[PDB]
């Protein structure tokens, strides 16, 4: 629980022995695995402790040298204490994060010649609002609404003209919006509102905005209030309610109305971006998919909102990336590319250049990309500003390079900045900061981490898919959390690197693709025409198709999964726990889709071992006739229809990944309606509510889980009720928390709310900006200009 | 629209003639009707001037002597302007309320001997939160929640919150509630809540409080967080939310659930109170009915809230009124009488005494009851404190006497005060303030209006049954509004008498009972024993029972009225408009219950002279066999089934009153499923949503009224189908607004939220208290010792 | 020097005897001269108590009735404290100024038929500089 909890050294012997066991090292920087395994034996010598076990299990790392243990303890999510204890006199002594970092620094890279620069955002963050409770992290906009509206009770009546001015400052294509003159004087606006509301009661509700436009110009009202008079009344009553007694719901509803979001600029500079061969390719993962789906959703919502307020303008989204001249049948040389499924969304590629540029010809790795980014950023400003009629209304960053670029851009243009990192590596590769010089030539984390810090501080909001990515869990620190404090020896120390409790953090999860994956019970949209291909692929044999197989006995319930062939997705372990417990072989059958059935010849090697182990398991456990394994890709729609097939008859999906960041396949399955057994570890922990929406299973316990699978397959002559109830649970859960519709609705509101928050809190943050700008010029700029040796 | 709208010098000849027509000095004080009269002849001379019609129709009154006319203008609801115009050279001059009231004073009672006392609540209310839009009046609790949470946010951002202390100070029946230690510390309470919660995670839902209590007590928690672990979790979660970021809805939900209220004291000292027997007695009436059908609902709710929080104490309700030793045939000499239908609800009766008292044996009229009330209040305070275990949690006053007593009682005890005036007679009797001297002998308004001002200002919240009771209409000023400023010659002048935008005003509308008036369509509950008796009341005739209808039209639609026979209830208007229209005559048959008649007196003189016009209009126009008539008074349980019968076989209710404040009758009708045609003038305007819940009729135009009714009767197959639409409309409107269950939920919340507002805002209100106490002692006390001579 | 200073219960018979000396009802309202006068003898029996002397000399007035003594103390310029003490069990109890004045009003003009109007400038003055 804390530093005082090490009074567990009444029973001194045990603590003494434990530190003894740590000090005998081979390693002076210990992490969790060693810290924990060293608790048991010596444990039985001498004692059995609950309190001590509690303590050890909360240690994140420890540093031993001297007769001195330096312990870093993380008792509750997002809270850290640091202490040191001496081997002989055992007296836990509180340390500051800085003291601990100075020790770690010393032990690792040796006595410091000069003094270390300590980057400290603490004084810069004092005074700004924070969430108080770890359960609430990622919910930032709710807190922020309550803060805004609670402080919008300015019955000083000068204010919130903040709200009024704000309403005055946005205009679309030169046309002033909401207000003809920038008015303030809350008493006047209440007047105008009263009159207008009154006239609208004598007008045909459905009157086009264009008919009552001049009359409203008389009353001081520019357009943007609505399409028909009914909507104008709605929005005007909203503002009238707010100018009287502000409340969180009201202010969110009205702020969500404002036709101030017109042009998006999404930024994803590294890799090969385009809609063709995904995944494949260097630097290009399901990276492209998030953005293409996101922008489709986004563009729909943009359009709808704008339309509803009666403003005719066409929204435009730009996805800006690098133009690589040496392409080879990717579209990556092609400067503008219209995005499929979107009216006005486009891909704009801008080339990298040298200072004289002289456009850089060939693909560059994302670990090498840093020296190009500033020049790139300038060219993107020029070109995107050219392509949209002016400034974007929101700039969204992607990964580390995208976020840095979005940072420079947003500062240049005065635009609200969103950050989607998707992954922060500092947590993935342990010790990579203290040791950064080793990893430097491959990875260049000196650049990446610095850029990361720069961006997470610079952003207006930060969007993540899971809570875990922010604060992690009781056991594991989160990805953003990792940056709170660290040393990069010979470069800088960081404390207060980020505030997990700042309300910039919003979890907005993706979902869908709901054109592709949808319920089995959908009265249309089903492709029944693709059912033959699917019964072919499940129940066929031989040299017809790339499989190992031929189950027969089809009358039973079914067990499905699909994944890249590995090792992490852990298909083989599913096979194995299927085998080892006979009651499951009894109750159902396994279908599997991935890699290559038939040899590894043919292809790619790589996965290799997992293909071979797959075959091996196949032979040895004699799993033919209970198991169908297909070695193919399965184009998306086909796959969707398949997940749909397995649902009725009463099937299940199981993705027993060792750990899964955010489960997409879990969502696609739940979307299709299959009751799903997913790994306990990572995103699925959030996605599925256990026994309601689906089932958490330990991938690290086989046949303990198979017992739960079989248990489910039972319950009253197969499953009349339960399966249906869990399917509805799944459907209900996807519909509530994971959908691109919901995503885009949120995203489009967040931009407006954080834009207002920026409008109000803007000048308060200038010391922070002067700090971040200095740190970019004098720290990032040198590091990147070394890359670039 | 306003003062400058007398720019009508655009046509000032018409203005001069309007003034001259006014100055003819038939009256010094010209009211609304006589002001509107002056605009019709002069009409045919000279011109029209719509502007002038706007101005004149917005005058509430004007005061004429000399060349000078003084005008009180009420442009829109609750907004006043005052001006003076000179007859000869006419230019308007803007006046302050003080100026206008001074001139009103020095005209009617003539020039002052010494300076008037101006009671001014203005400087006292300055600074307190108030509503802005007039349409929000009577919504107060909502506004207050918004100010409460808005302020709690900034306070919780700094160190403290009063919420915690307030949680500390209610211990119901001697046992400590909500908190064990007295800890004022928010961080601490956050920690305790955290642990408590995490510990509830480990138990399952239904664990009864009795079990959790000791573990909870180690954690710092007294009981009242819930009955089982589920609910404790629920409410501790509410407090956790609030302590993180206050919002109005969460705050109102948490406040709403605190086990504060186990004891009501309801005050009604005048009339003969008693269970039943009382209809027709002096000062008594359906006045008692409000209280008596309210308290069952109240008791039930109070108990429920307590039960849910897992506190087992039995709540008490005391209805306190006067002991009249003269039986006068009643139960009114009984000190403690249990209200039937309730577990713990009691009428506690207390004698009036003289200054040596010496119990006063005899009935005293409300108008003369003033001098006894302070003595009474002391006596009530003692007796009631004895009968309840201790202090009541809320004190409700009724009428003027009840409210003055509650004022006194609540200041002594420090208890939340609710006021229900039920009516405020200052608007009922024309000029009864300026002319108060005249009316003293009979009415004693000098005392009443003083106590009225006192009480309105003293109460923590005021419950009214309709909006217009507070702020009236575009035409009418409201009952409370009239106390905003007024003069009381040789006593004092009031300005700022009440603020209509004060959050203390809440419209909470009663209804029903509901064991009696319920939908014609019920699976059970109906009274068929009455069903033969019913038919034989309408259908039989002549000398075998009260007369005289003889309908004889078996399937003909029914038109039902039931009321007093008196002038304003206006049955005469209904029958008149019935005879006058032949089509209405053909479509349905008019049934009537009221009067004694039967012979003109004997019995019941002399206002039942309305029987004259009753027979006069019934014989000519040849009504009989078209229209049945009962002189019966209809025992309530029967009448309930009579309403239930008039639907299927289908029919309607008609309440053609000239003016009706609430219209409980209508509530009953609608509650029973009857489409209702109700007067436009008064509360029925609020109760019925026209062409949804019923229809509004202008009792003035009989042509259009009966026409409308007919048009209703002609719809579709003859209304299969739209009788049913309105019937369901009424049913739903009644379950969603007027029910004693709803009333009780709202009351039990209002008492908690205004308890907290009193708690939090009390010290700031101290100057207001000292002012009101001085006013009482030095002004009221003398006026009531004048009685009392 | 305050209500706490009648902790002069170190010598209890002194306090008791003093109250007795006062309580003999000659005047129920004593001013300084009387109040102080009564100090000397007690000043013999029993003891001296410079503390007690200090206290008594700071008394502005007292009101004696029943086994109850209502004291008004004025320790330093423009500061007053009010207390009442029971003749037999002697426990100083702190009084509000209203309580003390209610007692004086009762002792002098008799129990009251109606509540007294209390004029109070405190709320009015709260917040202005001092």
Task: Describe the model.
This is part of a larger assembly, with three copies of chain A. Chain A is of the alpha/beta class and 789 residues long. The first copy, chain A, folds into four domains: 129 residues, Nuclear Transport Factor 2, Chain: A (Roll), CATH 3.10.450; 131 residues, Up-down Bundle (Four Helix Bundle (Hemerythrin (Met), subunit A)), CATH 1.20.120; 301 residues, Glycogen Phosphorylase B (Rossmann fold, 3-Layer(aba) Sandwich), CATH 3.40.50; 228 residues, 3-Layer(aba) Sandwich (Rossmann fold). The first copy, chain A, is built from 28 helices and 25 strands. In chain A, the strands form five sheets. The first copy, chain A, has an eight-stranded mixed beta sheet, with helices on both faces. Chain A is globular, with a radius of gyration of 29 Å. The first copy, chain A, starts with 11 loop residues before the first helix and ends in a 5-residue tail after the last helix. At the A-B interface, helix 6 of A face helix 6 and helix 10 of B. Chains A, B: InterPro entries: Glyco_trans_1 (IPR001296), Sucrose_synth_GT-B1 (IPR000368), Sucrose_synthase_pln/cyn (IPR012820), SUS_EPBD (IPR056736), SUS_N (IPR056735).
Give the structural class of chain A. alpha/beta
Number of domains of chain A: 4
The proportion of strand residues of chain A reads 5-15%
User: What is the helix fraction of residues of chain A, given as a range?
Assistant: 40-55%
User: What separation lies between the terminal Cα atoms of chain A?
Assistant: 48 Å
Largest sheet of chain A: 8 strands, mixed
- Name of the CATH architecture of the largest domain in chain A: 3-Layer(aba) Sandwich
Q: Please write the CATH class name of the largest domain in chain A.
A: Alpha Beta
Chains forming the largest contact: A-B, 24 and 25 residues
Within the CATH hierarchy, at the fold level, what is the topology of the largest domain in chain A? Rossmann fold
- List the strand order in the largest sheet of chain A: 11-12-10-9-13-14-15-18
The shape of chain A is globular
Based on CA atoms alone, the radius of gyration of chain A comes out at 29 Å
Number of E-type strands of chain A: 25
Q: State the fourth-level CATH superfamily of the largest domain in chain A.
A: Glycogen Phosphorylase B
Output the number of helix runs of chain A: 28
- Tell me the quaternary state: part of a larger assembly
């Amino acid at each position: 629980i804390d530093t005082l909890a090490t009074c567990t050294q009444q029973n001194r012997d045990a603590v003494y022995t434990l530190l003894r066991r740590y000090f005998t090292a081979n390693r002076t920087l210990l992490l969790q695995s060693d810290l924990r395994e060293g608790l048991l034996q010596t444990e039985q010598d001498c004692g059995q402790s609950d309190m001590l076990r509690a303590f050890v299990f909360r240690l994140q790392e420890g540093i031993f040298s001297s007769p001195w243990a330096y312990l870093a303890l993380r008792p509750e999510i997002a809270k850290w204490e640091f202490m040191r204890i001496h081997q002989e006199h055992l007296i836990p002594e509180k340390l500051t994060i800085s003291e601990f970092l100075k020790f770690k620094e010393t032990v690792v890279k040796g006595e410091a010649t000069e003094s270390v620069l300590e980057v400290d955002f603490g004084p810069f963050n004092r005074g700004f609002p924070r969430l108080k409770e770890s359960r609430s992290i990622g919910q930032g906009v709710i807190f922020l609404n309550r803060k805004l509206s609670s402080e919008m009770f300015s019955r000083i009546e000068a204010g919130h003209t903040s709200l009024l001015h704000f309403l005055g400052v946005h205009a679309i294509e030169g046309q002033q919006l909401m207000f003809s003159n920038n008015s303030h004087d809350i008493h006047a606006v209440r007047n105008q509102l009263r009159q207008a509301l009154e006239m609208l009661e004598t007008l045909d509700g459905t009157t086009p905005w264009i008919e009552l436009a001049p009359k409203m110009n008389q009353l001081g009202f520019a357009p943007g209030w609505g399409h028909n008079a009914n909507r104008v009344a709605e929005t005007m009553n909203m503002l009238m309610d707010i100018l009287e007694a502000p409340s969180p719901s009201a202010l969110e509803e009205f702020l969500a109305c404002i036709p101030m979001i017109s042009r998006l600029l999404i930024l994803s500079p590294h890799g090969y971006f385009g809609q063709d061969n995904v995944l494949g390719l260097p630097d290009t993962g399901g990276q492209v998919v998030y953005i293409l789906d996101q922008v489709r959703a986004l563009e729909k919502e943009m359009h709808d909102r704008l339309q509803l307020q009666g403003v005719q303008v066409e929204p435009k989204i730009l996805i800006v990336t690098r133009l690589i001249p040496d392409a080879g049948d990717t579209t990556c040389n092609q400067r503008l590319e219209k995005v499929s499924g979107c009216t006005n969304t486009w891909i704009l590629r801008v080339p990298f250049r040298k200072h004289n540029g002289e456009i850089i010809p060939h693909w560059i790795s994302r670990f090498e990309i840093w020296p190009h980014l500033e020049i790139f950023a300038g060219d993107v400003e020029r070109e995107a500003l050219a392509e949209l009629g002016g400034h974007p209304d929101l700039i969204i960053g992607n990964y580390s390079d995208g976020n840095l670029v979005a940072t420079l851009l947003s500062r240049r243009l005065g635009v609200t900045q969103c950050n989607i990192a998707h992954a922060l590596e500092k947590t993935k590769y342990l010790h990579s900061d203290i040791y950064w010089q080793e990893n430097e030539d491959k990875y260049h984390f000196s650049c990446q981490y610095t850029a990361d810090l720069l961006a997470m501080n610079s952003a207006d909001f930060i969007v993540t898919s899971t809570y875990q990515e922010i604060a992690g869990t009781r056991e594991a620190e989160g990805q953003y959390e990792s940056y709170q404090a660290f040393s990069m020896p010979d470069l800088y120390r960081v404390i207060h690197g980020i505030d997990l409790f700042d309300p910039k953090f919003n979890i907005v999860s993706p979902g869908a693709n709901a054109d592709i994956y949808f319920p089995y019970s959908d009265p249309n949209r089903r492709l029944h025409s693709l059912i033959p291909e699917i019964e072919s692929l499940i129940f066929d044999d031989a040299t017809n198709l790339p499989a190992r197989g031929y189950l027969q006995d089809p009358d039973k319930p079914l067990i499905f999964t699909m994944a890249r062939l590995d090792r992490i997705k852990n298909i083989t372990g599913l096979v194995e726990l299927y085998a080892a417990s006979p009651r499951l072989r009894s109750l159902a059958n396994l279908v599997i889709v991935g890699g290559k059935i038939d040899p590894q010849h043919s292809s790619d090697h790589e996965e290799q071992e997992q293909i071979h182990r797959m075959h091996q398991l196949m032979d040895e456990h004699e799993l033919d006739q209970q198991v169908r394994w297909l070695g193919m890709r399965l184009d998306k729609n086909l796959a969707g229809e398949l997940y749909r097939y397995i649902a009725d008859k009463r099937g299940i999906f199981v993705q027993p990944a060792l750990f899964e960041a955010f489960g997409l396949t879990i969502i696609e399955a739940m979307a299709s309606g299959l009751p799903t057994f997913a790994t306990r570890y990572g995103g699925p922990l959030e996605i599925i509510q256990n026994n309601r929406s689906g089932f958490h299973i330990d991938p690290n316990q086989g046949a303990a889980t198979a017992d739960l699978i079989a248990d489910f397959f039972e319950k009253n002559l197969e499953n009349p009720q339960e399966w249906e109830r869990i399917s509805q649970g799944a459907l209900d859960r996807v519909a509530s928390r994971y959908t691109w519709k919901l995503y885009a609705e949120r995203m489009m509101t967040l931009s407006r709310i954080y834009g207002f928050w920026k409008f109000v809190s803007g000048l308060e943050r200038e010391e922070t900006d002067r700090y971040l700008n200095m740190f970019y010029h004098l720290q990032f700029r040198p590091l990147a200009n070394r890359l670039a040796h």
